[PDB]
Ligand binder design. Structure first.
Ligand SMILES: CC(C)CCC[C@@H](C)[C@H]1CC[C@H]2[C@@H]3CC=C4C[C@@H](OC(=O)CCC(=O)O)CC[C@]4(C)[C@H]3CC[C@]12C
Ligand SMILES: CC(C)CCC[C@@H](C)[C@H]1CC[C@H]2[C@@H]3CC=C4C[C@@H](OC(=O)CCC(=O)O)CC[C@]4(C)[C@H]3CC[C@]12C
Ligand SMILES: CC(C)CCC[C@@H](C)[C@H]1CC[C@H]2[C@@H]3CC=C4C[C@@H](OC(=O)CCC(=O)O)CC[C@]4(C)[C@H]3CC[C@]12C
Ligand SMILES: CC(C)CCC[C@@H](C)[C@H]1CC[C@H]2[C@@H]3CC=C4C[C@@H](OC(=O)CCC(=O)O)CC[C@]4(C)[C@H]3CC[C@]12C
Ligand SMILES: CC(C)CCC[C@@H](C)[C@H]1CC[C@H]2[C@@H]3CC=C4C[C@@H](OC(=O)CCC(=O)O)CC[C@]4(C)[C@H]3CC[C@]12C
Ligand SMILES: CC(C)CCC[C@@H](C)[C@H]1CC[C@H]2[C@@H]3CC=C4C[C@@H](OC(=O)CCC(=O)O)CC[C@]4(C)[C@H]3CC[C@]12C
Ligand SMILES: CC(C)CCC[C@@H](C)[C@H]1CC[C@H]2[C@@H]3CC=C4C[C@@H](OC(=O)CCC(=O)O)CC[C@]4(C)[C@H]3CC[C@]12C
Ligand SMILES: *[C@@H]1O[C@H](CO)[C@@H](O)[C@H](O)[C@H]1NC(C)=O
Ligand SMILES: *[C@@H]1O[C@H](CO)[C@@H](O)[C@H](O)[C@H]1NC(C)=O
Ligand SMILES: CN1CCC[C@H]1c1cccnc1
Ligand SMILES: CN1CCC[C@H]1c1cccnc1
Lengths: 132, 237, 186, 96, 49, 44
């Protein structure tokens, strides 16, 4: 998050997919009987990429928030400091809280990445088996 | 001849063979390709209905020499071809008579009204769901923190995407100023809100970076912007 | 009824050339009026909606580092609308549509905005250790500051103050000339 | 004539010459450009198979006078021109 | 007058030359001035810190 | 403009390099600290 260009990448991906989708709707007939498989795949990817952009703006807000405003350390330190040992990730005044805040942001980002990559891999291969 | 032609042949132009009977009867069934002009009413796009009319009639004869009688009150569809995009709700024939400025006698005619509907799956799976998706981001920019410094990028991207969708759909529908399409109005409404969002967010972003040694003014602002936070149900420091 | 187009009157006159003594004809004239609502709600609204950012850009603070993005985006949108409105109008070089002239003027305005923006952005990031140049600027800008009705007041902050003052000046004169540009449309 | 036209010539328009034999036999072979309409099924795009139909027949003659009989069960391809975009898997005729 | 490979005699012909000009206002207001304008940014990048 | 983009990525890499990676000051301080009066620019 600290580089500050993740929303740029998300928007680039989403607009490029939108352009390719709009492009293919020129070439395939405007028929409502069936839907093209490529069209379905592209719409699926658009759904998941906009879900990705909302979750990433959320994690971006989680990251930058300051220890002087959004402290709430009671509930968070219990859970988001114990998911890491389960997720197979090695562990490590105001600077300490800022480091903790950055760390919880990175951890939620990783744990979302695992689910999203599993879902993507499942949705691509698990859908492309009509012929075989 | 049909009165409602636009860039096409008025009368039948193939002149194929016909059938005679011994009593003097004659039957003739020419095929043709007709091009009519019906007022495409696009308001509930794409959940649309079309009421298109064709108007056949004699040209050089009156009711005192030729009279028309509709054999079937409805159009037969036993050889219809499912276009895949359009389905015919109904096709009604009506026998009418008029009187023109040219002449004195009255002239008959047959008006066929086709009421048809569009299957909506295609445009709802390829055109409106992406724009309805990317319109759900205009509220998202405000939650993004100020110091990160990429909010204007998101706003510009959303605004240009909405403009692209609007200028795209302006081709697919008729430029008839009698009514406005619903999707067009919705997209323009979202553009108004996104433009408003970008100017208010550049305002708040300027409020962010300003330094104490330049724009102090602490009297009026602290009293109000430090006691609304409880009203807004948010914790203080 | 035709829909988008409306008829006004149908004059019809017999033209006769007395000099040729052989030429006869009947000329009908059609005076057709376009219903404006459609193009108004599809071509003018986006233009007037995005044209305000042209002058809005300056109120963005320089330290954020985003003036370039917004300004280039405005310029690109204006170029797109210009090409489109040129493709929709008949290619006749006898006259110019008014919307096109307005777009061209505001495009020149925004391409002047981009260069004054890079100027303020360069004069902002100077360090107080390299480009001091105090005496010629201190007095002139401390005298200029009250001439703008701006609040009063380690040299890096002074350069930041200078950049803020000058781009506020440009915002003032830019909105003052844009009001006159909008008046020139009438 | 063909029944599946879409903005095209219903019948052949060149009206070339024809051969007559002494026994009374007659043969005729006009070229034509046809525009038929296909129920385009696009699901396995682009790995697609297209099934197009054309429907020839008489117009004002019933089976009580004219009876059509197919000569070849398949469409000849001796003068085929390789388009480069489409390959003909097969072409089948059916009497109905 | 010319002469073709077919024949021995000469053959007459009339050649009309139209010399015309293009009214530039449309193109000079829509195509060349935008690119000539954006060309004023190729050097501007170096002055930016 | 592509020549400009390559020269500007070059200079932008030059700007951000740290004193602990690309020191090499001997030959550079003689050439790029006497060229300033040549280009009519003031020093610190
Ligand atoms: C519904 C299916 C298709 C996907 C579900 C993913 C999101 C809709 C959910 C999963 C975790 C949620 C979030 C959980 C935490 C909160 C904090 C809250 O403040 C704002 C909503 C948010 C980000 C939720 C937003 C939406 C999220 C990303
Ligand atoms: C398909 C699009 C509309 C998804 C966009 C999700 C946000 C518009 C919503 C989902 C949960 C909401 C939040 C729910 C919790 C609140 C707490 C409230 O205090 C401020 C708004 C907020 C953050 C909401 C902000 C906006 C959020 C992120
Ligand atoms: C007419 C419709 C499009 C409503 C547009 C809203 C603006 C007219 C208002 C909403 C909040 C206002 C602002 C509120 C705060 C101030 C600070 C003030 O200094 C200058 C005007 C400004 C930016 C206002 C400018 C105009 C703003 C954007
Ligand atoms: C519909 C479009 C034209 C809205 C344009 C919004 C800004 C270009 C205007 C709205 C209120 C203005 C401000 C009104 C108050 C002043 C105080 C003045 O000191 C400096 C300019 C400023 C901030 C103006 C800056 C520009 C502002 C934000
Ligand atoms: C040829 C067109 C693009 C005219 C562009 C205007 C600039 C050449 C002038 C207008 C005000 C000037 C500035 C006026 C104030 C000074 C402060 C000075 O310190 C450095 C130059 C500067 C920024 C000037 C730089 C150049 C500026 C921007
Ligand atoms: C037809 C093309 C070549 C026009 C290119 C525009 C530049 C030749 C001018 C426009 C504004 C000028 C600048 C205006 C401000 C100054 C500050 C001054 O210090 C040094 C020159 C500089 C950057 C000028 C450099 C050259 C600039 C970019
Ligand atoms: C056609 C004229 C304008 C020369 C083109 C400029 C660059 C293509 C050349 C000129 C000197 C070169 C450089 C010479 C020194 C090196 C150091 C080396 O480390 C990296 C490449 C670099 C910067 C070269 C990059 C490219 C440079 C700038
Ligand atoms: C279609 O239009 C005709 C002629 O205006 C009208 O009589 C008829 O009511 C319309 N059809 C329906 C279903 O409204
Ligand atoms: C193509 O359609 C025809 C007509 O229905 C059908 O008989 C034939 O089986 C189809 N061809 C294939 C390969 O299915
Ligand atoms: C019945 N036709 C339709 C419009 C004109 C009218 C008409 C009257 C007399 C001769 N030809 C045509
Ligand atoms: C038997 N033909 C095939 C379809 C139409 C029908 C027909 C009806 C009347 C005159 N000619 C042909």
């Amino acid at each position: 998050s600290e580089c500050g260009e993740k929303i740029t990448l998300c928007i680039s991906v989403l607009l490029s997919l939108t352009v390719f989708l709009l492009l293919i709707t020129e070439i395939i007939p405007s028929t409502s009987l069936v839907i093209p498989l490529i069209g379905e795949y592209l719409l699926f990817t658009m759904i998941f990429v906009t879900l990705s952009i909302v979750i990433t703006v959320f994690v971006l807000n989680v990251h930058h928030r300051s220890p002087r405003t959004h402290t709430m350390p009671t509930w968070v330190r219990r859970v988001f400091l114990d998911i890491v040992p389960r997720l197979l990730l090695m562990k490590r005044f105001e600077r300490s809280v800022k480091e903790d805040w950055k760390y919880v942001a990175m951890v939620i980002d990783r744990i979302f990445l695992w689910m999203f990559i599993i879902v993507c891999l499942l949705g691509t291969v698990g859908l492309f088996l009509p012929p075989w | 001849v049909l009165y409602n032609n636009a860039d096409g042949d008025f009368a039948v132009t193939h002149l194929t063979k016909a059938h005679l009977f011994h009593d003097g009867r004659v039957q003739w069934t020419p095929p043709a390709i007709y091009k009519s002009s019906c007022s495409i009413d696009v308001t509930f796009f794409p959940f649309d209905q079309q009421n298109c009319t064709m108007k056949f009639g004699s040209w050089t004869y009156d009711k005192a020499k030729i009279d028309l009688v509709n054999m079937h009150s409805r159009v037969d569809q036993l050889d219809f071809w499912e276009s895949g995009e359009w389905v015919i709700v109904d096709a009604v024939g009506t026998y009418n008579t008029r009187k023109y400025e040219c002449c004195a006698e009255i002239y008959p005619d047959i008006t066929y009204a086709f009421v048809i509907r569009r299957l909506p799956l295609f445009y709802t799976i390829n055109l409106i769901i992406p724009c309805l998706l990317i319109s759900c981001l205009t509220v998202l920019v405000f939650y993004l923190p100020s110091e990160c410094g990429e909010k204007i990028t998101l706003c510009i991207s959303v605004l240009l995407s909405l403009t692209v969708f609007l200028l795209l759909i302006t081709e697919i529908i008729p430029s008839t100023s009698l009514v406005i399409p619903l999707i067009g109005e919705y997209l323009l409404f979202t553009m108004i809100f996104v433009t408003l969002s970008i100017v208010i967010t550049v305002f708040v972003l300027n409020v962010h970076h300003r330094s104490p040694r330049t724009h102090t003014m602490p009297t009026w602002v602290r009293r109000v912007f430090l006691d609304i936070v409880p009203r807004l149900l948010l914790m203080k420091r | 009824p035709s829909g988008e187009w409306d008829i006004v009157a149908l004059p019809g006159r017999r033209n006769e050339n007395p000099d040729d003594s052989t030429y006869v004809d009947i000329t009908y004239d059609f005076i057709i009026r376009r219903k404006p609502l459609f193009y108004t709600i599809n071509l003018i609204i986006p233009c007037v909606l995005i044209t305000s950012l042209a002058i809005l850009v300056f109120y963005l603070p320089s330290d954020c580092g985003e003036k370039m993005t917004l300004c280039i985006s405005v310029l690109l949108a204006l170029t797109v609308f210009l090409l489109l409105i040129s493709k929709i109008v008949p290619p006749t070089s006898l006259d110019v549509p008014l919307v096109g002239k307005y777009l061209m003027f505001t495009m020149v305005l925004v391409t002047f905005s981009i260069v004054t923006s890079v100027c303020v952005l360069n004069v902002h990031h100077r360090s107080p250790t390299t480009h001091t140049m105090a005496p010629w600027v201190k007095v002139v800008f401390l005298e200029k500051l009250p001439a703008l009705l701006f609040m009063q007041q380690s040299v890096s902050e002074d350069w930041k103050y200078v950049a803020m003052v000058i781009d506020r000046l440009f915002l003032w004169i830019f909105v003052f000339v844009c009001v006159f540009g909008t008046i020139g449309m009438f």
